[PDB]
């Protein structure tokens, strides 16, 4: 949701004077979740528990929303049967916003919560390479589509105005 690049290393020991500094980019709602997800990956990948390690920095990245960009996320999710890998492309203004879109579509269709999804890679996909038909549809310059939901406006207006003289035309 915010995008944090988190750095961490094992505690310095007589056996190794400078342990390796590791860097990961974690998308999380807040810094405490980002430092928890950092250590979850570090524990499995490099055998570094939080007690045995330090957090050098948790830098928050600011991303421009001036233009919509095609984004591509490769993730792994656990369903009840077992773990699976999945590539999802979403067009969004910023990379954090695209990750939010990915998390909501995963919760809606695959019923997978944030904790059981690991984000292997988040990249900005080029307009030429768009394996997902949905992102390819809006990629072309001319995209005139009739309003998907013009019913919502009249239904929303009718909440305040419960009783109307005429039935509203959409």
């Amino acid at each position: 949701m915010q995008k944090y690049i988190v750095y961490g290393r094992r505690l310095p020991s007589e056996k190794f004077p400078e342990p390796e500094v590791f860097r990961m980019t974690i998308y999380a709602p807040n810094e405490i979740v980002a430092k928890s997800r950092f250590w979850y990956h570090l524990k499995s990948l490099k055998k570094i528990k939080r007690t045995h390690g330090e957090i050098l920095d948790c830098q928050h990245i600011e991303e421009n929303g001036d233009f919509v960009k095609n984004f591509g996320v490769l993730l792994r999710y656990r369903s009840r049967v077992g773990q699976h890998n999945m590539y999802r492309e979403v067009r969004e203004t910023t990379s954090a916003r695209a990750m939010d879109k990915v998390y909501s579509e995963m919760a809606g269709q695959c019923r997978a919560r944030y904790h059981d999804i690991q984000i292997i890679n988040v990249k900005e996909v080029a307009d030429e390479d768009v394996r997902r038909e949905k992102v390819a549809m809006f990629t072309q310059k001319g995209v005139r589509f009739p309003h998907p939901c013009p019913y919502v406006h009249v239904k929303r207006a009718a909440r305040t105005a419960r009783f109307q003289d005429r039935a509203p035309h959409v």
Binding site: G65, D66, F67, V68, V90, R91, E92, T93, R97, K134, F138, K141, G142, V143, R144, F145, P146, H147, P148, C149, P150, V152, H153, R156, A157
Partner: protein, 130 residues
């Protein structure tokens, strides 16, 4: 689906949200259910808004691709669409609706009496005609 398509530059009216009650231009389509809207001359900042908030106005602004904010403001200023919408029935009602919001409890009292004067004046006009 006959007219009023969600296209680049279509003038939009925000039905819901922080910038509700204001007009904007679709800079780009983000998805079937979201667009990137910005209205510098109407004060709406660039944001991605669900199409469920956006109401499509009949006017479309001729813009370049990737409008930016400064280029977009220049294009919106050149187009006569913004003023044409305001002079149109929806726009005139939109201007009236804004005045209605700027009204205290006291200004409701003056507006309720005036309405009852209209209610009884109309009945006098109707009876006299018959």
């Amino acid at each position: 689906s006959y007219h009023r398509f969600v296209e680049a530059g279509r003038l939009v009216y925000l039905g819901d949200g922080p910038d509700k009650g204001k007009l904007a231009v679709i800079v780009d389509i983000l998805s079937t259910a979201a667009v990137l809207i910005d209205g510098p001359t109407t004060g709406v900042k660039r944001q991605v808004v669900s199409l469920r908030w956006a109401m499509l106005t009949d006017q479309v602004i001729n813009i370049s691709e990737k409008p930016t904010t400064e280029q977009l403001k220049k294009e919106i200023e050149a187009s006569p669409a913004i003023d044409t919408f305001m002079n149109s029935v929806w726009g005139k009602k939109i201007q009236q609706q804004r005045l209605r919001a700027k009204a205290t409890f006291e200004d409701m009292g003056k507006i309720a009496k005036l309405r009852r004067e209209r209610k009884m004046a109309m009945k006098r006009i109707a009876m006299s005609i018959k």
